[PDB]
RNA sequence: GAAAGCGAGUCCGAAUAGGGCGGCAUUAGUACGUCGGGCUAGACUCGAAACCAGGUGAGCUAAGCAUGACCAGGUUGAAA
């Protein structure tokens, strides 16, 4: 599987759809515009 | 990191000392080739004494069995 980690830095909107993601990855996406979709 | 796992962080720990990593001030790989070297094969070439497997030999020699052959001449003089 997949996973986003919080290395880049320009702020933008994304929709990700990673097989998981660290703590400061999905409060990174979320706070420059976007959602990350983790499966059940 | 032993691992779960967490992730530019992570591991010992009960938070603060430190290991390893990142940023590093910071530069990049991959495929094929030729060459250096490594490893694995007989591994620069030549040489054992030996060990193991299957077979060949008793026409030599050691013996055994079967059936044949051989021992001039002279001396001594047992029992009966």
């Not at 599987?1 to 702020?11: D, F, Q, R, T």
């Not at 933008?12 to 979709?37: C, N, Y």
């Amino acid at each position: 599987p997949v996973k986003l980690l919080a290395s880049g830095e320009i702020s933008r909107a994304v929709t990700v759809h990673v097989d998981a993601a660290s703590a400061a990855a999905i409060k990174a996406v979320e706070a420059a515009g976007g959602r990350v979709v983790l499966p059940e």
